[PDB]
Design a protein around this ligand. Sequence first.
Ligand code: ZN
Ligand code: ZN
Length: 55
Amino acid sequence: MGSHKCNVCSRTFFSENGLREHLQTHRGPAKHYMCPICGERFPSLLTLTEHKVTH
Ligand SMILES: [Zn+2]
Ligand SMILES: [Zn+2]
């Protein structure tokens, strides 16, 4: 047994499933994309696409 806990906050979960949903809140809202080839990060899946082709 134990406690499925955030660790980042360490102070919150609604449940184990609650924590699972809550765990992703620290990735943040996805208004960006990470590069397939070199993993550089750009403010959209558009700026990333421009970066991708002229790599
Ligand atoms: Zn948290
Ligand atoms: Zn790249």
